[PDB]
Amino acid sequence: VLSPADKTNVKAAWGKVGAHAGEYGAEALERMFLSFPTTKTYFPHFDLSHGSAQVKGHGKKVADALTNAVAHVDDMPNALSALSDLHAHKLRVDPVNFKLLSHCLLVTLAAHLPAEFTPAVHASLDKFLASVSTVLTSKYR
């Protein structure tokens, strides 16, 4: 449901991020584990304390997967087919938690990219993050 004005926005603000993606992703989780303790359940084999390398290493993957989606924003179902299967049959994360991350992500983009975080872009991204949550869970049943 992303209008042209939407892809231009998403691409625009995700272009400014650039190298910082890893750092940014890493913070989105820390805000998630602290603001929504029930998402800590999916990581009982991690060390969730501030500065955890594991959390920074995971954020990196998550963020690269979004950069990958922003590139192939026209054909996501396929660029993300391998991730979709992984979350559907192996990780089995309840669909709800996808909303908590998206939210925690946008928050991390505002406290870092204030000039480009206009109410227009703000709405394009949320949709974007929604659109990725619709794919990553498409095959749960």
Binding site: Y42, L91, R92, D94, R141
Partner: protein
Amino acid sequence: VHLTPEEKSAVTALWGKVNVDEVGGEALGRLLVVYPWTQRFFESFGDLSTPDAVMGNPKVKAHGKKVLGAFSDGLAHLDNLKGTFATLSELHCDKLHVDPENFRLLGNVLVCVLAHHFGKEFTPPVQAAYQKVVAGVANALAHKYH
């Protein structure tokens, strides 16, 4: 939760004809067929391929006996749900790592079953009371989730 004296009597009346052990295996099996992503905890249960395999698994059935048992014994302390489940709440978080959402999915598949089980007797006013009760039981299990 806060049910009226008429709503509580209702709950108890209908639960006096519930075969706790059968409904247990029907509730826990249906939770794993409609929402397969719950199966993530029962790898050590064996065949969960087909709905029949899931519905005829002696382990799923046995676990259902437990769940709906601990559930049925909580109907006696409707006025103190948290107290009664304060320990299982702690356990599900720290050692089982079970996402609290599951108690909401199970609480709704429990309502659809009692509906399929009693028919016309499962009336709209009766359903609500049960909805308040399942929510209340879910809320209590997720009370000590740090």
